[PDB]
Amino acid sequence: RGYDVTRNPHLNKGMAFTLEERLQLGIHGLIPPCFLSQDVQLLRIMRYYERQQSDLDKYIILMTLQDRNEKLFYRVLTSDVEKFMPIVYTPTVGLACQHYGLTFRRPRGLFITIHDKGHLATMLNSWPEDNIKAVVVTDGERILGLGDLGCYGMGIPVGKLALYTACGGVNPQQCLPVLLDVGTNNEELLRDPLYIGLKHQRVHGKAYDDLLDEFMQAVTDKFGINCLIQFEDFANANAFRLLNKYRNKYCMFNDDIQGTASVAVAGILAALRITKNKLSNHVFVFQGAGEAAMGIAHLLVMALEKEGVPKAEATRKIWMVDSKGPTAIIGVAFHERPIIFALSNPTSKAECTAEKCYRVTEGRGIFASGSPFKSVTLEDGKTFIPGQGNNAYVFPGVALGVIAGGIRHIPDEIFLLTAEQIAQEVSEQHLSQGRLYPPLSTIRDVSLRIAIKVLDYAYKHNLASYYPEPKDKEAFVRSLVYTPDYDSFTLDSYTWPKEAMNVQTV
Amino acid sequence: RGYDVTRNPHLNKGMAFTLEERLQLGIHGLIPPCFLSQDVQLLRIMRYYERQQSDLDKYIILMTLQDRNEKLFYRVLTSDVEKFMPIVYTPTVGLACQHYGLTFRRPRGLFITIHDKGHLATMLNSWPEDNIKAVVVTDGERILGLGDLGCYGMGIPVGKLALYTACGGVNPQQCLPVLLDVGTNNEELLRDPLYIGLKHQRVHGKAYDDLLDEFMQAVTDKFGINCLIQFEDFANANAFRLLNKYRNKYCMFNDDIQGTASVAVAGILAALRITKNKLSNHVFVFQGAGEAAMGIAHLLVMALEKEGVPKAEATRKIWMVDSKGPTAIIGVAFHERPIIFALSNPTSKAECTAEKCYRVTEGRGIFASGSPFKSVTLEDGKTFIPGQGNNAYVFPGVALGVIAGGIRHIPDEIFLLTAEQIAQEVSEQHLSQGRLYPPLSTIRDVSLRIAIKVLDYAYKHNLASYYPEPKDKEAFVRSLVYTPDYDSFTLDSYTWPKEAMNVQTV
Amino acid sequence: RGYDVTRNPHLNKGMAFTLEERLQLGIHGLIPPCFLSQDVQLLRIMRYYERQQSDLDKYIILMTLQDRNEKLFYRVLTSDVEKFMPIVYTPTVGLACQHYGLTFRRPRGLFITIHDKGHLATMLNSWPEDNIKAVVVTDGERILGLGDLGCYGMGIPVGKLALYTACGGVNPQQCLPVLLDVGTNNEELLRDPLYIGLKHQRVHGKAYDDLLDEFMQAVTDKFGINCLIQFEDFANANAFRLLNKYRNKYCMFNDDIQGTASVAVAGILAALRITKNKLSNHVFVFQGAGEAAMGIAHLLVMALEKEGVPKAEATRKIWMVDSKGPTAIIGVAFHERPIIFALSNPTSKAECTAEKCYRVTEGRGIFASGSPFKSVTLEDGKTFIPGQGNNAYVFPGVALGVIAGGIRHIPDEIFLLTAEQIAQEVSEQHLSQGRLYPPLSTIRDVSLRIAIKVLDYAYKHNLASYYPEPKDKEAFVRSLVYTPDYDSFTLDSYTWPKEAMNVQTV
Amino acid sequence: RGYDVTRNPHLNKGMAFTLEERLQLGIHGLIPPCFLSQDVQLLRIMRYYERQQSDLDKYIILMTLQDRNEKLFYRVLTSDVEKFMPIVYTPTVGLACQHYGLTFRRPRGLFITIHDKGHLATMLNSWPEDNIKAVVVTDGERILGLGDLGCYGMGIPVGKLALYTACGGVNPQQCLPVLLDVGTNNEELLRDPLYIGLKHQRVHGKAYDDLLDEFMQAVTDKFGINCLIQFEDFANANAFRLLNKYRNKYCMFNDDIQGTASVAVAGILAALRITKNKLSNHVFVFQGAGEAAMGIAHLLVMALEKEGVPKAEATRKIWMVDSKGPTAIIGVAFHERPIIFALSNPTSKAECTAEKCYRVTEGRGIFASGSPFKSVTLEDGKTFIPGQGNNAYVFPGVALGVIAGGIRHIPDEIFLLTAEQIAQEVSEQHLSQGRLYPPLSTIRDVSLRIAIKVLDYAYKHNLASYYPEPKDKEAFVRSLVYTPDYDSFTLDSYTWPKEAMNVQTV
């Protein structure tokens, strides 16, 4: 296998191929005559990356790195993941999606069209990898903040899958980004000459649903019923409907619904680690009961149940207010330490400023947001580093645990225990600064722990299909955690005793 | 052949693959669900290309296009070749070479090192294409204007090979860019951490020469003695020595020596088309007799001989002046229409300003340069569009004629008749504006003509090895001219009479 | 994929490729210009096959067919399987094994040597198929009747795997024949110059065992813990030891031990279908208690337990006699219908002649053998077609059920219910002739039923790992039954509405 | 490249792969654990080969060897070529052709049908090798002795190509056997259910001719005008017509016409080496002037011309008698040493018995035949080993010289000088026994010499296209002579100085 190795991003090491490797692979001459470690390659990529004057340019550099040398791509990511997550995934990935006609380099992923109904198995055969354990599929209809972007949203399952690997350690060769193109209702794309999608309105109803049914059937026929299928930015009602439809038939989840709710409940439990009270000692007023607070309320009721409180009064503790009409305030549209959750994305759609809370409540108010908020310079001297609830706290570790143990379905208990682990992740010195989530530089480790917990759950509820149940699940998950470290392409040469390998010259 | 087709730049058409082609190639799903002609792809590439604020960025866009979709790359080039020649080749390619550590995307070409002495055949085996008809090899030692750039000069044989295809129509799959890395004497690269080459001094003498001997031997052993081997920016003395060594042993030429001289003689003959006199009615004073004016003087003497004038007095007509000591003045360091040739590159190293000549000589002076010179606004009203002598007038057409007819060696007569054809290319209305060279937008056609002439010569002097000699050489060369038009990847399905293709069910 | 298709036996159809298929596969011209159905190909193969004057020649023809066109090979087999089972498998395969140095055509299978200890994963990587669901491994040490044949015994896992497909419908591409060469103690092979194996004595003890441990580990690391690993002709004590070692750690079984016992118990239960009594109404005297009657006695005790009779007296019903010291007599070394089982292979090592029993017992004696016995011409007029207990009644259907449902381990209950199904297979008109086993021409169907039963068991005892449990297991097993029918290699071409597939010419 | 190497007959060495080679090729485990030299493999093949009781069985063994391991196949052939020539080629190949429906193993060659008119380039693309330097094409219409065998005659270009390699040393990978199926007029094949060809009458006239024109055009378009195209057993008139048509347009010859004539003239000149006279001292009576003696007479006239005798009287020396009406008697239907040539094939169609000549002429008669004739036991004591004129004396060496030097056309002078070299090959002690041709065990050497002579001719008449003309043509031809010796598949690993190959860990 010669020149084709330098064209495979999973194999190509660039100038990190040693001379022995280049000679054994038949690629000597195709690479410049220098031999680099991955550290030097990282430094060179970083120099080229810091010369860009845009997040779009940085994104293009990272995507070219991904399609050249993906071990180096994930070395770039897993080195300062907090820096590259905004560029590879939201927010920058949404803007790149907005500008994919202009900035269309090599295409990545699988584009499955409504007009391919009946032939999705062949389209799956078109993907080069055959051992696919995770599929992130998007509709393109509700790209975060940007609305309908159909067939430009392909950067979302790609970017998100990068976070599967960067934050979780999921093997990138076992990941399949899919965009289901059923048309778009975005009028600017129907007229855009650079638009790469179907230029008609979105198909919906008994053709959309049958396309999705055939997609799930084809994916689990080719890759097995254990294939994790995550649904990306679908429309809200459509997303919830598909979640309820496929949740128990397949190994699917929706990170926008279940991951967001899990992060919110994680923040609430981390705040309880400060209020020193039980979840039963809390009454919750929600502010955005528009399918977003529904997941938070359900998972919070489930946590109240698990700590002992039966369903009815656990539901009595929730006061969901939206446009018609205490201890914890959560918005997605009296007490010593009130819990205020902004949880709204664009930093302008929000409930507070992380300084409004901390300067109005006299600083004795535990704030959390889904929007980036700089530290506080409160007059008394309290600093109050405010924590941000990233969805990357949930889906990488959950996906790693589900892929590791072949978990067949992802019930809500998985997400509750994920929230519990994320709550336990926060250090008391971080809680001293009002920080409700672990730092992103720890996400790998955090993911690992979550995976183990998820594994520990799935075996004790007969959900894990991997056999036999590993006695030590930490080392089993660690054996599946993908690392950006290069493999050795040198050939394992050994010999036999010099009487078995004797060439007979009879 | 599925996903690998989208990774082969010679095959990949991107969204220009039709649905039938995508289904037949097993690549359906890998491409966005839109179907474009090459015109729409060109418009999209041009939109992305005009958004760049640098020639380096434009160069990077074009090189990414080349390694994605090379039919589209050559469609971009052959559309307004005058615009993209400065970016793909000199001057911009030299600056990119200066910045190849920073801007190192996918590597192209073959890097053959002095330490590979004895194993060059294996390195040639490393190149994916087996039918190589043109090899542009560089040392990296005398990159135009930039000096020693060793192992950064790989962009020079790549860029130049692009001009082989864009300007000449040479098949890009039959072209092999080679950089011979023997070390570098550039001290800034020996310390540069981004440097991709050997970090020692240049090897020279009986090891350099044996490396070059083995390189020529290996190239003609793998690709045949008819393989055209062009020597790129070697050191001046080294370049001339290698030219004289390999000129009659192989199908080699040096475009810096022979191409430059041919362009200069072409300009001189085009100027004679204005002075209305014979070449014998001219006495030539040279100004830069430093191996650069030597080729011009030799080829000019050869032209004087061919028009009738024997060698001795033809040499008597040349007055080469440099630092120790009429009708035509040529510099590379009385009469009605004096011929002034600047021929110096950086527009600052030169002999005139194309306005100094035209305002001092009262406009009755035929000027030519190797430097870009804007038009003149002379007070009387004479405009005087000054022509520029590009090396792309010579090497593409000569290479096309040599590859077409399997010409075994390229004598100086080839370059003289190339200069004669280029002189004949200029229109009388262009000569009315003082323009000595055809416009670059015509280069393809010009190359074709040159090829035919070269072919016509090689057959009548028993130099063309292609058999049988085509009766109509224009259509034979046209059958080999590569075009950026996409091929059809659909399968030629036919049937037999429905008694021969009957399936026997005995 | 052109010429390589005609070299792949799983793909190559020979002259059964249609013209459309030949043109689409790029193989047109490589095949003679005739188009045959598989029926005509079968007739041609049969004509060539009936021209041979030896079972060795017939075997060579069938093995060449297997390595040319394996769909046609299995069409030949599954057509009159009773005729080709003696040639593909025992007895003829043993004689071919004896003569593999002389008759060494293309090698099939994987040869793993004791000197490969530590590198078995790479050797498994050497096998072209990656989806292996059944591995038949042999030591070569106890080839049936022939003794130690080490590294000539490779025809045994090959032949047996053929029966996996011919009799069971197991996919042949998911089958891997392995020979573990640890040397041989056969002195004639150590001196044989045609011998293809290690020419030293058998390795044994802590190196043999570690080689087997690494083999099981490597096979289940590459192909999954669900890979069925059948142990072939190992030495008796070695075979039983390995069975007990790996029985619960892996999905392994030994067909010589468990399959033989299952066939014997099947014959006993079929005979009970004639004696009209319960198994509790029988006392069993065995004659060959040398690890061969042990399995029969254990499985018979298990059947007595399952019908109601507790362990102690169920064991009291067994009288195993060998060299020191009624209703049923079984040998592997009073009542209305005595049951006499010869069960000994070479027709000379046996307990009766199938005529001795029927002429001495006055015909009222139910005889079964493991040796071929022609019908009886008893003086009264009773014909008494005597049945033969083939191991192919057990292992194909059990393997099909285990591969279908991903059964993790094969307990003895699987083999008991297999024996019960085989007993139920016999028709009452066949029991009227004293025939205790179904005819081999039914084996496919029989295998299917066994598979379903095995499946039905594994799900109700939480042994089947395939998910979800199919509601209709017959159609699920039928979907996995491999058939010799050719697939269509024509490409599924469809179109989009002629507005989505419109090529944009903007 | 793993398992595919064992499936490529040009690469596969079987058990001759060393352990290092098996590990480097990723084929370890696919081969039995023994390591053989080609001598041991030859001995094993010979043991299996001498166990056959038919020339048809021996032929099948050799063809299976050819499609398994072609270096070993040509080692078998080039070892005792006199023994295996009758089996690989005529006479046995004709009988195998008669029995190709019964004995149809793996197909070899390219079947191009009349119904493929217009698509022969695609069919040539179907052949796996791209560097084809020799094409033996047959019609199947005049298979030697057997008549029309259409599409069974494919064994003739295969067998003959084997002799290209075995006797000449032509590279087998550069050889392409083609059968042009235009139907058959053999009535037994039109009804034969095993027949693999077109079951209609032969196409002829303006469709046959256009198919042949497109075949020659396609072969020289894909493989170059230097591709040697030999026409095999075409019909006599058709063969001569095609020879005259394509002789000067392509590098074609007909071995049945020109090779036979060259062998006959070689025998005549060798006999002159006994009669001690000049060719001008001979008058020739022919007996079979039916297009077979025409070539002999033309080449003999050419030899008379070359020795000095002008055309007219040189033709006066020929007396061609057939059914209407001295020194040399030649049949294809006074003096001290009369020359009697039987030259008729089936030993029953002939002019003498090689004993009739030697017992009637009193032993002083130089006999030659085309039929095998055992030695003579003449009463006086003279032994008279009679020589046989094989066509393998001509076509292998001529083909080697034509492929070596890229000779563009094969004029009759090539065949005359071939006859002269073959005449010179005979030793005087062999001439003492009345043997007119060199022994076949020398054919390789003989071929070499012929090649050199042919090369020496083609350069001095400007027929050789290979450049540059090698100063020593013996060593140039020897560098192209293919040998059955195995290549080494081990990888050439070298290192750089341990400062150039230092991995930078900046």
Taking the C-alpha atoms of residue B219 and residue B127, their distance in angstroms, rounded to an integer, is 12
Query: Is residue D228 a contact partner of residue D387, using CB atoms and an 8 Å limit?
Result: no
In 3D space, the residue among D100, D103, D200 whose CA is nearest the CA of residue D143 turns out to be D100
Angle, alpha carbons C278-C284-C288 (nearest 5°): 145
Tokens of A212: 């999705």
- The approach used to solve this structure was cryo-EM
Amino acid, res. A204: H
Taking the C-alpha atoms of residue A447 and residue A467, their distance in angstroms, rounded to an integer, is 22
C-alpha distances out from residue A129 to A132, A177, A222, B271, Å:
7, 12, 11, 64
In 3D space, the residue among A162, A157, A153 whose CA is nearest the CA of residue A95 turns out to be A153
User: What's the 3-state SS for C222-287?
Assistant: HHCCCCEEEECCCCHHHHHHHHHHHCCCCEEEEHHHHHHHHHHHHHHHHHHHHHCCCHHHCCEEEC
Instruction: Locate the domains of chain A by residue range.
Output: 3-256, 257-462
Residue C494 DSSP label: -
Collapsing DSSP to helix, strand or coil, B283 comes out as coil
Query: Is residue B70 a contact partner of residue B9, using CB atoms and an 8 Å limit?
Result: yes
Residue B502 DSSP label: P
Amino acid, res. D258: Q
Taking the C-alpha atoms of residue A23 and residue B219, their distance in angstroms, rounded to an integer, is 19
Residue A345 annotated as lining a ligand binding site: yes
What phi and psi values does residue C176 have, to the nearest 5 degrees?
-130, 110
Q: Which residues, 6+ apart, have CB-to-CB distance to B248 below 8 Å?
A: B409
Residue D108 DSSP label: -
Taking the C-alpha atoms of residue A374 and residue C46, their distance in angstroms, rounded to an integer, is 84
B217 CA: distance to closest CA in chain A (Å):
17
Q: Is D126 in the C-facing interface, judged by CB distances under 8 Å?
A: yes
Q: Is A109 left (phi over 0), alpha (psi -120 to 50) or beta?
A: left
Residue among D22, D41, D44, D501 with most chain A CBs within 10 A, to mutate: D501
Tokens of B1: 């052949």
In 3D space, the residue among B45, C501, B32 whose CA is nearest the CA of residue A197 turns out to be B32
Amino acid, res. A17: F
For C297-431, where are the E strands, in sequence order?
318-320, 328-330, 339-341, 366-369, 387-388
What phi and psi values does residue C442 have, to the nearest 5 degrees?
-100, -5
Residue D116 DSSP label: G
C-alpha distances out from residue A481 to A66, A390, A397, A477, D378, Å:
19, 21, 10, 6, 91
- Do the chains contact at C113 and A496, CB–CB below 8 Å? yes
Bond preceding residue C468 cis, omega within 30 of 0: yes
Residues, chain B, total?
506
In 3D space, the residue among D309, D307, D296, D232 whose CA is nearest the CA of residue D262 turns out to be D296
Amino acid, res. D468: P
C-alpha distances out from residue D1 to A153, B36, C107, C125, C174, Å:
39, 37, 18, 12, 21
CATH code matching the domain that covers C392-478, chosen among 3.10.20.30, 3.40.50.10380, 4.10.910.10, 3.90.1170.30:
3.40.50.10380
- Do the chains contact at A40 and D495, CB–CB below 8 Å? no
Q: Is B346 in the A-facing interface, judged by CB distances under 8 Å?
A: no
Report the largest interatomic distance among the alpha carbons of chain A, rounded to a whole angstrom.
Answer: 99
Q: Is B106 in the A-facing interface, judged by CB distances under 8 Å?
A: yes
Residues, chain A, total?
506
Q: Is C122 in the A-facing interface, judged by CB distances under 8 Å?
A: yes
Query: Is residue B139 a contact partner of residue B150, using CB atoms and an 8 Å limit?
Result: yes
- Residues 82-101 (C) with a CB less than 8 A from some CB of D: 101
Considering only CB atoms, C491 lies closest to which of B23, B505, B506, namely B23
What phi and psi values does residue B179 have, to the nearest 5 degrees?
-115, 125
Collapsing DSSP to helix, strand or coil, D70 comes out as helix
Collapsing DSSP to helix, strand or coil, D139 comes out as coil
3-state DSSP helix/strand/coil % of chain B, to nearest 5: 45, 10, 45
CATH of domain C258-389: 3.40.50.720
- Do the chains contact at A39 and D506, CB–CB below 8 Å? yes
CATH of domain A257-462: 3.40.50.720
Residue C142 annotated as lining a ligand binding site: yes
Residue B256 annotated as lining a ligand binding site: yes
Q: For residue D243, count other CB atoms closer than 10 A to its CB.
A: 18
Amino acid, res. C486: Y
Bridge partners of residue B328, in order along the sequence: B284, B339
Taking the C-alpha atoms of residue B143 and residue B92, their distance in angstroms, rounded to an integer, is 12
Residue C337, CB-side half-sphere exposure with 13 Å CA sphere: 16
Helices (H), B50-151: 55-68, 70-78, 81-88, 92-98, 120-125
Angle between helices B443-460 and B412-425 (to 10 degrees): 140
Query: Is residue C191 a contact partner of residue A506, using CB atoms and an 8 Å limit?
Result: no
Amino acid, res. B315: T
Residue B299, CB-side half-sphere exposure with 13 Å CA sphere: 29
Q: Is D502 in the A-facing interface, judged by CB distances under 8 Å?
A: yes
- Total beta-carbon pairs less than 8 A apart between chain A and chain C: 41
Query: Is residue C286 a contact partner of residue C319, using CB atoms and an 8 Å limit?
Result: yes
- Superfamily grouping for domain A3-256: Malic enzyme, N-terminal domain (3.40.50.10380)
* Cα-trace Rg, chain D: 24
Which residues on chain C are in Cβ contact (under 8 Å) with A499?
200
Residue whose token pair is 């033809």: B314
CATH code matching the domain that covers B275-390, chosen among 3.40.50.11540, 2.60.40.1840, 3.40.50.720, 1.10.490.10:
3.40.50.720
Taking the C-alpha atoms of residue D129 and residue D173, their distance in angstroms, rounded to an integer, is 7
Query: Is residue D188 a contact partner of residue D25, using CB atoms and an 8 Å limit?
Result: no
Collapsing DSSP to helix, strand or coil, A23 comes out as helix
Bond preceding residue B484 cis, omega within 30 of 0: no
In 3D space, the residue among D293, A64, A198 whose CA is nearest the CA of residue C504 turns out to be A198
User: What's the 3-state SS for D484-501?
Assistant: CCCCCCCCCCCCCCCCCC
Which residues on chain D are in Cβ contact (under 8 Å) with C3?
126-128
Bond preceding residue B346 cis, omega within 30 of 0: no
C318 CA: distance to closest CA in chain A (Å):
38
Q: Which residues, 6+ apart, have CB-to-CB distance to C295 below 8 Å?
A: C257, C258, C260, C261, C264
Nearest-10 Cα torsion for C459, C463, C469, C472: -50
Considering only CB atoms, C126 lies closest to which of D27, D124, D199, namely D27
Taking the C-alpha atoms of residue A126 and residue A121, their distance in angstroms, rounded to an integer, is 9
In 3D space, the residue among D352, D289, D358 whose CA is nearest the CA of residue D319 turns out to be D289
Q: Is D488 in the A-facing interface, judged by CB distances under 8 Å?
A: no
Tokens of A40: 């030097």
Residue among D496, D505, D506 with most chain B CBs within 10 A, to mutate: D496
State the architecture of C87-246 in CATH terms.
3-Layer(aba) Sandwich (3.40)
Q: For residue A145, count other CB atoms closer than 10 A to its CB.
A: 13
Q: Which residues, 6+ apart, have CB-to-CB distance to B217 below 8 Å?
A: none
Query: Is residue C142 a contact partner of residue C46, using CB atoms and an 8 Å limit?
Result: no
Catalytic pick among B71, B133, B160, B317: B160
- Sign of the torsion formed by the C-alpha atoms of C138, C141, C143 and C144: negative
Residue B277 annotated as lining a ligand binding site: no
Amino acid, res. A311: K
Taking the C-alpha atoms of residue B123 and residue A27, their distance in angstroms, rounded to an integer, is 8
In 3D space, the residue among B19, B63, B16 whose CA is nearest the CA of residue B40 turns out to be B16
Query: Is residue C95 a contact partner of residue D1, using CB atoms and an 8 Å limit?
Result: no
Taking the C-alpha atoms of residue A458 and residue A453, their distance in angstroms, rounded to an integer, is 9
Tokens of D158: 């295969």
Bridge partners of residue C181, in order along the sequence: C113
Tokens of A258: 């279940």
Bridge partners of residue D388, in order along the sequence: D369
A70 CA: distance to closest CA in chain B (Å):
13
Catalytic pick among B59, B74, B89, B152: B89
Taking the C-alpha atoms of residue A420 and residue A304, their distance in angstroms, rounded to an integer, is 12
Residue A201 DSSP label: P
Amino acid, res. A327: T
- Superfamily grouping for domain D254-459: NAD(P)-binding Rossmann-like Domain (3.40.50.720)
Quick check: do A3-256 and A257-462 share a fold? yes
- Do the chains contact at A500 and C200, CB–CB below 8 Å? yes
Q: For residue A310, count other CB atoms closer than 10 A to its CB.
A: 9
In 3D space, the residue among D188, D190, D195, D235 whose CA is nearest the CA of residue D212 turns out to be D235
Closest-CA residue of D relative to C41 is D194
Q: For residue C361, count other CB atoms closer than 10 A to its CB.
A: 15
CATH code matching the domain that covers D80-246, chosen among 3.40.50.10380, 3.40.50.300, 3.90.850.10, 3.40.190.10:
3.40.50.10380
Taking the C-alpha atoms of residue A106 and residue B3, their distance in angstroms, rounded to an integer, is 13
- DSSP string across B401-453: HHHHHTBS---HHHHHHHHHHHHHHS-HHHHTTT--S--GGGHHHHHHHHHHH
Residue A259 DSSP label: I
D181 CA: distance to closest CA in chain C (Å):
8
If 0-12 CB within 10 Å is exposed, 13-18 middle and 19+ buried, where does residue D347 land?
middle
- DSSP string across D153-217: TTHHHHHHHHHHHHTT---GGGEEEEEEE-----HHHHH-TT--S--SPPP-SSSHHHHHHHHHH
In 3D space, the residue among D409, D410, D391, D55 whose CA is nearest the CA of residue D256 turns out to be D391
Tokens of B307: 């028009």
Closest-CA residue of D relative to B194 is D506
Taking the C-alpha atoms of residue C328 and residue C271, their distance in angstroms, rounded to an integer, is 10
Residue D416, CB-side half-sphere exposure with 13 Å CA sphere: 15
CATH code matching the domain that covers B37-246, chosen among 2.60.120.200, 3.40.50.300, 3.40.50.10380, 3.40.50.1110:
3.40.50.10380
User: What's the 3-state SS for C120-185?
Assistant: HHHHHHCCCCCCCCEEEEECCCCECCCECCCCCCCHHHHHHHHHHHHCCCCCHHHEEEEEEECCCC
Taking the C-alpha atoms of residue B170 and residue B164, their distance in angstroms, rounded to an integer, is 6
Residue D385, CB-side half-sphere exposure with 13 Å CA sphere: 10
Residue A255 annotated as lining a ligand binding site: no
Report the largest interatomic distance among the alpha carbons of chain C, rounded to a whole angstrom.
Answer: 99
Query: Is residue C55 a contact partner of residue C87, using CB atoms and an 8 Å limit?
Result: yes
Angle between helices D443-460 and D412-425 (to 10 degrees): 140
B29 CA: distance to closest CA in chain C (Å):
13
Active site residues of A: 89, 160
Q: Is C230 in the A-facing interface, judged by CB distances under 8 Å?
A: no
Tokens of A196: 């790469």
In 3D space, the residue among C29, C96, C34 whose CA is nearest the CA of residue C62 turns out to be C96
